[PDB]
Amino acid sequence: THSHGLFKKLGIPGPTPLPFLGNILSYHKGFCMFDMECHKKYGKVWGFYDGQQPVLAITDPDMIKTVLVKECYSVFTNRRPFGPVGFMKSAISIAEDEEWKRLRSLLSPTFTSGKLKEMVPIIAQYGDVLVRNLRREAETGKPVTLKDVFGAYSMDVITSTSFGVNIDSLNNFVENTKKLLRFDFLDPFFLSITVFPFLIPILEVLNICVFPREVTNFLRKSVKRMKEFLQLMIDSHKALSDLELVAQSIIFIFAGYETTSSVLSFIMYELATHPDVQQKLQEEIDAVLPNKAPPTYDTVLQMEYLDMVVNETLRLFPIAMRLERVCKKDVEINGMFIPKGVVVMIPSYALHRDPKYWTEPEKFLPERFSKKNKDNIDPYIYTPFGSGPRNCIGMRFALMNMKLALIRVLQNFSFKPCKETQIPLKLSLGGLLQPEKPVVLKVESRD
């Protein structure tokens, strides 16, 4: 337990680590609370230890720009290798160095504006399915669990756009990609792996992994039954393998399900707790789409206030919480020596709520992102989708998918806080950015 002396010899402050555990006991208050308190106590830069792994947090916009953009291909190319992943090591978000660069090139044409434009009529059909299912619980007279309806919509969207299967999940493959697509408190296992990272090779050789070794076997034979986004990988650097075909699919499914449904639930909580914003957004939607006109590609991009609501919600709730890069070699960025093997981390949650760049950070104020004030927002302090060559590849898809769902939802319904609604919203202290109690709101039809 002697890596614990690296930050003191470097002159970098931080919390004093305990033997074996490091600083992981400070995660009791939550990973995000630990980042904000370290930022207030140590200032610009600090370091801590996840067990024996040294992590260096940076808050300077120029230094964040160097890590994520300038020295990406050379120094900060890969993310932190985490617990037993098995064949998921071939996934793009997991691949490293040249194997990632190949997959990034093979999958970048999937998310072009031309491909995204052809997905609008497909995912607009499920927006109508979402509105239909939203009424049978709106006419029910009792509050709605938003994560359930948004979860079924996110799965219906990602299943048809990635492959081509069209299922109504809320009324029902789905049983293997919904229940078998949930995260039943892997927090204790993630903590033990962090404390015992040397046990990872043992779990790998035993073929033990975070995912169940069936869901993949289901998707493995499902993709094999589909032969006669999934098109681009088959039509074809280096040709993609069949097992690597499934790896990228699973990443897109988890990305399309959890991220899209979680942020949509955070948005509706802010619209219900701020009705004047909800009305102003419905007025912009009604003015751009008169008489409940169906949303289109060019239409969604015209709604300026809709973009401000999504941006402000992504400020308060950056579902990735952190950006991380592994230091491949000894470097000196912006006047600071970074030794090899240190996980450089950018605390997005803490930076999005820093009282240095934001007026009243705890307030939900869409006016920060208006055409006037948006110029004063540093793109390396507000990083909801990351930045640089390894940023979110599905940023435009996620923005388009969420906005299409928000428009169709707000065209027909209004959302008010129910008696069961937790106000203020408290965040879970686990490894995922999600509310403590599930978001429930009263839904009322507008017509």
Q: Is 392 annotated as a binding residue?
A: yes
Edge-first strand listing for the sheet containing 45-50:
45-50, 53-58, 343-347, 322-326
Q: What is the DSSP letter of 398?
A: H
CA-based nearest residue to 274, from 364, 358, 369: 364
For the chain, report the end-to-end CA distance as a whole number of angstroms.
65
Collapsed DSSP state (helix, strand, coil) of residue 378: coil
Q: What is the DSSP letter of 257?
A: I
Q: List the single partner that 98 binds among its own copies, ligand HEM, none, CB under 5 to 8 Å by kind.
A: its own copies
Quickly tell me which residue has 């074809």 as its tokens. 236
Task: List residues binding ligand HEM (CB under 6 A).
Answer: 68, 92-93, 104, 251-252, 255-256, 259-260, 263, 319-320, 323, 384-388, 390-394, 397-398
Residue from 175, 330, 367, 444 in contact with its own copies (CB under 8 A): 330
**Which residue number, 60 or 204, has a Cβ lying nearer to its own copies?**
204
CA distance 385 to 368: 18
Q: What is the DSSP letter of 70?
A: I
Q: Does 202 bind its own copies (CB under 8 A)?
A: yes
CA distance 158 to 179: 16
CA distance 289 to 285: 6
Torsion angle defined by CA atoms of residues 18, 21, 25 and 31, in that order, rounded to the nearest 10 degrees: 120
Residue from 135, 221, 238, 446 in contact with its own copies (CB under 8 A): 238
Amino acid at 73: Y
Collapsed DSSP state (helix, strand, coil) of residue 26: helix
Q: Which residues within the stretch 341-400 sit at the binding site for its own copies (CB under 8 A)?
A: none
Do residues 118 and 220 make contact, with C-beta atoms less than 8 angstroms apart? Answer: no
**Which residue number, 5 or 81, has a Cβ lying nearer to ligand HEM?**
81
CB of residue 221 to its own copies, shortest distance in Å: 18
Q: List the single partner that 126 binds among ligand HEM, its own copies, none, CB under 5 to 8 Å by kind.
A: none
Q: List the single partner that 385 binds among its own copies, ligand HEM, none, CB under 5 to 8 Å by kind.
A: ligand HEM
Q: List the single partner that 301 binds among ligand HEM, its own copies, none, CB under 5 to 8 Å by kind.
A: none
Binding mask 48-77 for its own copies (x = CB under 8 A): ----x-------------------------
**Which residue number, 353 or 442, has a Cβ lying nearer to ligand HEM?**
353
Phi then psi dihedrals of residue 331, to 5 deg: -140, 165
Q: Which residues within the stretch 86-115 sit at the binding site for its own copies (CB under 8 A)?
A: 98
Q: Does 329 bind its own copies (CB under 8 A)?
A: yes
CB of residue 194 to ligand HEM, shortest distance in Å: 19
Q: List the single partner that 319 binds among ligand HEM, its own copies, none, CB under 5 to 8 Å by kind.
A: ligand HEM
Annotated binding site for heme: 392
